[PDB]
Design a protein around this ligand. Structure first.
Ligand SMILES: CC(C)C[C@H](NP(=O)(O)O)C(N)=O
Ligand SMILES: [Ca+2]
Ligand SMILES: [Ca+2]
Ligand SMILES: [Ca+2]
Ligand SMILES: [Ca+2]
Ligand SMILES: [Zn+2]
Length: 316
């Protein structure tokens, strides 16, 4: 759309008021011209045909319940763009300011969100297992980060490289949640998962075992479902990332924490410079050690904490 940049206001899934960047041309569109080549949010109208219609509103006010998921998908994609640019100096997911597109209201009672190779897609949930998925900032950032990975390491979505793919998206979605200071934690999907049960989440990085996921390589899933456990074995790497950042003793192995910022810096560097499509856990270990070496020196505590963390989860 070609028009005048302006700012509208709306209410998100959680009932929170926020300002969003829109474009005016007869109607007000969910098109943010301030970031790279634009952030665009579309209405999929309960269908599966993508992307749907660029979102149009008559008055630049988005307070209707049907507006909520589009408000959040549009605002959280802006925050994620900002985290990448400000923190890692990367312009959009491809590093060249590619337009970011998201579609909301996909299908009926769809309990998921995904990156389709070209855009982000968000279900509205069935109302009990999930509420509309774009209401969680870690969900939005997990999604966008799959674009990032797709353009950098290119990790295949299966087996070890696929669980690394999943871990990366969980790691940066959590860093983006802390970056926005939106009640941050080391859990995934908590804000949108099982609206009737408090205190749970889809996955835990601090304790993957809480929901049954492995927190040690010896407990890795060797089967076939979920593309060989991409969403299951990612718990081994999540726990490793959580220990590097926060510290702790796990299975008897002690890790001194180096904090969040350094964790994001070493992972980003491994992602963009050393990981390949077919990297396995042992290769991620080498890539992370080499990144921390590049950045802090071989004899750094940073390098020491990375080795400890991987020895704690049984990776190498
Ligand atoms: C973060 C979750 C709400 C959704 C995510 N969807 P994916 O196809 O991008 O992996 C998942 N299943 O963890
Ligand atoms: Ca309106
Ligand atoms: Ca949170
Ligand atoms: Ca979270
Ligand atoms: Ca819940
Ligand atoms: Zn994912």
């Amino acid at each position: 759309i070609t028009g005048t940049s302006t700012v509208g206001v709306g209410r998100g899934v959680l009932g929170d008021q926020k300002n969003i960047n829109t474009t005016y041309s007869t109607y007000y569109y969910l098109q943010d011209n301030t970031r790279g080549d634009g952030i665009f949010t579309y209405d999929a109208k309960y269908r599966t045909t993508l992307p749907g219609s660029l979102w149009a509103d008559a008055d630049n006010q988005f307070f209707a319940s049907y507006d909520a998921p589009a408000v959040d998908a549009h605002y959280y994609a802006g925050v994620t763009y900002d985290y990448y640019k400000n923190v890692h100096n990367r312009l959009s997911y491809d590093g060249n300011n590619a337009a970011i597109r998201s579609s909301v209201h996909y299908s009926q009672g769809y309990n998921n969100a995904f990156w389709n190779g070209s855009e982000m897609v968000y279900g509205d949930g069935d109302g009990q297992t999930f509420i509309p998925l774009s209401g969680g900032i870690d969900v939005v950032a997990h999604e966008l980060t799959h674009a990032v990975t797709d353009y950098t390491a290119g990790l295949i979505y299966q087996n070890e490289s696929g669980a690394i793919n999943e871990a990366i998206s969980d790691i940066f979605g959590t860093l983006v949640e802390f970056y926005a200071n939106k009640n941050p934690d080391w859990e995934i999907g908590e804000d949108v998962y099982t609206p009737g049960i408090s205190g749970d989440s889809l996955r835990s990085m601090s304790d993957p075992a809480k929901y049954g996921d492995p927190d040690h390589y010896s407990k890795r899933y060797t089967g076939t479902q979920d593309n060989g456990g991409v969403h299951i074995n990612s718990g081994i790497i999540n726990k490793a990332a959580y220990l590097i950042s926060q510290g702790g003793t796990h299975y008897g192995v002690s890790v001194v924490g180096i904090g969040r910022d350094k964790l994001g810096k070493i992972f980003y560097r491994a992602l963009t410079q050393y990981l390949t499509p077919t990297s396995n856990f042992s290769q991620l270990r080498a890539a992370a050690v080499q990144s921390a070496t590049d950045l802090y020196g071989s004899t750094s505590q940073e390098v020491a904490s990375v080795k400890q963390a991987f020895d704690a989860v049984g990776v190498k």
